[PDB]
Amino acid sequence: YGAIYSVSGPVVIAENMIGCAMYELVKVGHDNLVGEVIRIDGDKATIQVYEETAGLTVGDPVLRTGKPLSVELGPGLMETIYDGIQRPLKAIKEESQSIYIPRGIDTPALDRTIKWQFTPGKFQVGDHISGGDIYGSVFENSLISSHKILLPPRSRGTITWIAPAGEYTLDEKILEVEFDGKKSDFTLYHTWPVRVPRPVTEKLSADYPLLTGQRVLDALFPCVQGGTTCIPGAFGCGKTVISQSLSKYSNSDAIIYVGCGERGNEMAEVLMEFPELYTEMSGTKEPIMKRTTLVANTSNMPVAAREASIYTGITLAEYFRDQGKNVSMIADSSSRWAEALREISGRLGEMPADQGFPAYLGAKLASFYERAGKAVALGSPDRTGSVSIVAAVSPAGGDFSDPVTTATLGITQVFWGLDKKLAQRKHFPSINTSVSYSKYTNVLNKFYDSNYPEFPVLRDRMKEILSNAEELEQVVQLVGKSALSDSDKITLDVATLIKEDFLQQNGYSTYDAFCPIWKTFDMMRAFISYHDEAQKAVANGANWSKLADSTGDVKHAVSSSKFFEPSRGEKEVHGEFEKLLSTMQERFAESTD
Amino acid sequence: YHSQVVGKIGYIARCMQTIDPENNLKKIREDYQDVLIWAEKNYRFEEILEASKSGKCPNDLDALSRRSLILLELLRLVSSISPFKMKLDLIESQYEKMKQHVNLWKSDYHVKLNQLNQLTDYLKNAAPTPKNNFLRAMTSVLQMQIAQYGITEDNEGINQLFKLGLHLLAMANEKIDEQYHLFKGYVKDQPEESPFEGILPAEDQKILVKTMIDYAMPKLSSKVLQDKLSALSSSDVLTKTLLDSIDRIV
Amino acid sequence: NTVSGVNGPLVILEKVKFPRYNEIVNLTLPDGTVRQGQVLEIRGDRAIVQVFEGTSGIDVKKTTVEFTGESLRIPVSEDMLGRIFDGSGRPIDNGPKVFAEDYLDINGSPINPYARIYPEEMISTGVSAIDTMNSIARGQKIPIFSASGLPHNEIAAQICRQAGLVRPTKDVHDGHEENFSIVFAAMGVNLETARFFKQDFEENGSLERTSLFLNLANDPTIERIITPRLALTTAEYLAYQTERHVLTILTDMSSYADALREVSAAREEVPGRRGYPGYMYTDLSTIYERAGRVEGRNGSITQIPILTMPNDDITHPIPDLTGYITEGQIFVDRQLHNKGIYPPINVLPSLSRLMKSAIGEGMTRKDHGDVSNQLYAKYAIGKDAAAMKAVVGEEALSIEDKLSLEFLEKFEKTFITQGAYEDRTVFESLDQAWSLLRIYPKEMLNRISPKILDEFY
Amino acid sequence: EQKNAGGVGELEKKAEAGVQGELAEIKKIAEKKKDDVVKILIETVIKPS
């Protein structure tokens, strides 16, 4: 198409633009380097090269790819590791035997050797089709199929060619659409741009909770599925432990991991730790790696994968939410994407902004958090889906007043802090009562209380004991150890056992990863009834050590109740709490006398 | 805009034709006559887009998704009850009861259909274990009782069968004693004489009776216990008296 | 002609300068997408236009030009109330058209109805802390200053839900003489917050008398910036044409300022301080100019925008220019919201422009300004005495600081303590503040007259 | 609470049936002046503007 006019630095200038848009990606020269036209000034177009420009001279042709810079969505995304630019990591590990993509890569974004069985849907010949309807289904998992074959956006017409059932590849076509003549060819996989979100029928308010398995996380401030959550990272404070524990202990059908500016060790530890550990949903043949999607880009790769990693993860999470499954988007971190966008903005020659970041970082960060959420499926088939955006926010430039952490903290309505002492203390997450907050706890308590919750009464009482013990610790330190009363020792003793039983979790057994809502609901009622019975027993005349020694195995069994199996009452309710309430009521009379 | 309305009308007509091929639903098909009228005759995309551009047809995304959610839940509930069949009056009463409900996304009908669909999807690619056979028989009896009693009634047998199938689906490969003891306790706790008679085949009950007789067979080290345990292995149907008589021999 | 170049959201075209400024232009490309925009700059054999549809994917030698012949104006009509629309002026439900009858320019007011009389009609909203500490008038622009991690949307939804129920009892008090209307403008907000504000608008009963603009972070900044001028033009056209008091809430100011800062670096304009644009006074002056009484003595345009800090600092040009350009401000404290106070309205740096000329006779008392000034000075001296009592101690302090320390503790949890659905009149706030104000002697109280102070302590 | 699930559908049937008299006068009064507006609309399009 165009001719190379000049090459200065990492950016390339090409003239002879006769229709090349500023959103389409193409390869400059004969090396097939990754690049995209960022701007255009007259006949000469400005394209940013994210790869090595060695061996490029003036007078070379520029071949366009024929579409915008996006990623391919189809079968085979699970159980594979790729970059943000849709680069095959398993193909580079098979051919080159390395984890870094070389310069001049032009392979496809999906594997073509793994064939899948395509089954036809309820659509027949003669009926009109449209984007959003389920045209078929293809297996993508190791045991079952979860990738629903739907119509892509910007397409409609009649089904002129109906492919039958059988095994086919991604390159071979199985469907054809007829609209105004020869519109285009359809296959198993489809292309979609990463700069445009997936359209749906309508958006709804998120009221469903994320099945993770944290007793203190679900009990104190339960983050619902489909809300924006921000967490401050420290690069070693517990950010990778929450993603690794949330990926393995989580029982969701879909999972998307987005690595924008990681060092490389966390992507290899999370990638190698996935097939070794099993899941809680009874999966087999790599259930952790098959139900999760790996998108890991290091800090030494090009900025196109780091900047397009959030758009590829948001597009794959939008396609997974449009397919009807719930996917959790865990990203780390936004500071590497903001620094990668600021490096391309400063290298391209654009005007700078406050704090050295670009002016579009606030609109891209607001559009990235606003793109996720719970919504219905597009087209006529309405399905239930949710997209939880949990992105970490590390420091950039050695400051705390930048608009990245302040804009992400002010834009989000849920917060989960992480401390360096809490990660060393075996606490996950490292926030007890002052490091986390949530505004959607009213709807989450209305839905979880809508199923069969008793957490709505003990929700404020659970945080009230920790706030009373934390407020009493400063009065005990500054005022004196003998200034506290007997009720403060029972409240701090109940908050220590509730924080040690609920917040104290490091995956010691198989019951500390997956936690039901019934055990967390009865666990707060057992500690609330033990604190109320301890305060009422101490109010009638008794000692603190005489009351704790009078309790004994009743209070000691509540701390060791997490070690027991979760199938105590039917399959999820703890039966030790129901008899422990009457046992604590019978022990309350012996504790007073 | 127009592609979601034309694809929603054609997908609603194709879903209504795929739901009932006999066309015996005059109550549900009576309300959808305005959408089936454009699909039962010659109507191009320009006529539906031109009629929808002037407000001569339904063009609301919330009303079209809410009206299509009842047909999607009815088609998913009628499709998840296979191979059993439901009556047309029961499907019309279930569609009329689901249409008159304010909540059609947060109700227990989609959670029960997703719970039965998880047991059917887990039973469609199950391994060679006895939990897939006992969960297949309990899912067949739960599908027969769910198709016979409807999704609008909250019976204790469908909740106990769904709780036993959900508890059996959460088990692992190192819990065969808990699945056999849970199947024996669930079969002995039923108030009927045989819950698999007239639902499952004789080979499916003979595989479970041969599984329990083969499980209790290795613990017998006597001639009287071997003859008494072998005397209960010639039956082709499963019952509570066979499990109670086999438990007394071991 | 064709598109000569494209840099960000603005595309440079080779069209002639025969068309007038602000005229709509339509770009036709071969990819199957049409984008409409307004010409931001005109020149000889060249022009720069900012499109409101599409961000990337504009061809250079494949784009076409079309002359619409109409200037960039939002059509305001009386049929727009009762439907959900976008920021660019398009409905998201796929329903009927806009059906606008009048033409209102977005760059500056086209009538200029500057009222020559100051407003003295107190407009109530159902908050004893907001209306008591800051005097409100018909058309007084009072913004809410918040920070990162503060629930400004809950206070705006509580002000929108509480605004509409006090108008029937306030209509007989001579506080209002027209109907109440709301203006909904959202830019860079979540769908759950827009549905929460739509639930408060439907619960309050203002859904059939207000227009909603849905703007997110996935659209262009040029289309999102046109929503506040269209909402203020519809509120000013409905208030001036219908003679009704309309309250316009536009959130957030940082999302609208982010589009101006993003549309200032690609242009030839020099940026200002803190990485912001140097022409923010002209853009903020257009929104701040549409405020006050209207022609006829029966209508007004009140603006209650929510402004969030982009960095959590008091040295930004948006809060300094917006706070100085407005006639007041509502301060929000993180310690009040974290302590358990609802709503977290700070009374220390909170001050109103009109305190002695905004209350009249029939709907408010004359001692409300002296009680608000004495409560503000007692709140500031009680805050300094509370900081000195927290730092040094109550034993080292004098006896005069103990009365202000107890008055700040009682007024902190008594005056600013209210529910999310309870209303409070302005007359009950003076009697409730008079009981808490009787903690000191008559010599220490010097922010009121001796007749009103001697008649009621 | 039992009158909020199924009892709110009668308010939409009463509002759809309650607007049948206003939908006829709009097309009835608008159909009369269509010929006078079509001739004025044709003359504006047929003239050089």
Curated annotation (Swiss-Prot), chain A:
Positions contributing to ATP binding: 233-240
Domain of life: Eukaryota
Membrane topology: Peripheral membrane protein
Modified residues (Phosphothreonine): 107
Keyword DNA-binding: yes
Phosphoserine found at: 380, 450
Keyword DNA-binding recorded: yes
Record localization: Vacuole membrane
GO cellular component: fungal-type vacuole membrane; Golgi membrane; proton-transporting V-type ATPase complex; vacuolar proton-transporting V-type ATPase complex; vacuolar proton-transporting V-type ATPase, V1 domain
Subunit details: V-ATPase is a heteromultimeric enzyme composed of a peripheral catalytic V1 complex (components A to H) attached to an integral membrane V0 proton pore complex (components: a, c, c', c'', d, e, f and VOA1). Interacts with RAV1 and RAV2 components of the RAVE complex, which are essential for the stability and assembly of V-ATPase.
Miscellaneous notes: Present with 199895 molecules/cell in log phase SD medium.
Name under which the protein is recorded: V-type proton ATPase catalytic subunit A
Organism for this UniProt entry: Saccharomyces cerevisiae (strain ATCC 204508 / S288c)
Lineage, broadest ranks: Eukaryota, Fungi, Dikarya, Ascomycota, Saccharomycotina
Curated annotation (Swiss-Prot), chain C:
GO BP term, pick one: proteasome storage granule assembly
Keyword Nucleus: no
Superkingdom: Eukaryota
Topology class, membrane: Peripheral membrane protein
Positions bearing Phosphoserine: 109
SUPFAM superfamilies in alphabetical order: P-loop containing nucleoside triphosphate hydrolases (SSF52540)
Role this protein plays: Non-catalytic subunit of the V1 complex of vacuolar(H+)-ATPase (V-ATPase), a multisubunit enzyme composed of a peripheral complex (V1) that hydrolyzes ATP and a membrane integral complex (V0) that translocates protons. V-ATPase is responsible for acidifying and maintaining the pH of intracellular compartments.
Stated name of the protein: V-type proton ATPase subunit B
Gene: VMA2
UniProtKB/Swiss-Prot annotation, chain D:
Subcellular location, record wording: Vacuole membrane
Sections of the chain in a coiled coil: none
Domain of life per record: Eukaryota
Other known facts: Present with 2280 molecules/cell in log phase SD medium.
Family assignment from sequence similarity: Belongs to the V-ATPase G subunit family.
Free-text function comment from the UniProt entry: Subunit of the V1 complex of vacuolar(H+)-ATPase (V-ATPase), a multisubunit enzyme composed of a peripheral complex (V1) that hydrolyzes ATP and a membrane integral complex (V0) that translocates protons. V-ATPase is responsible for acidifying and maintaining the pH of intracellular compartments.
Protein name: V-type proton ATPase subunit G
Record organism: Saccharomyces cerevisiae (strain ATCC 204508 / S288c)
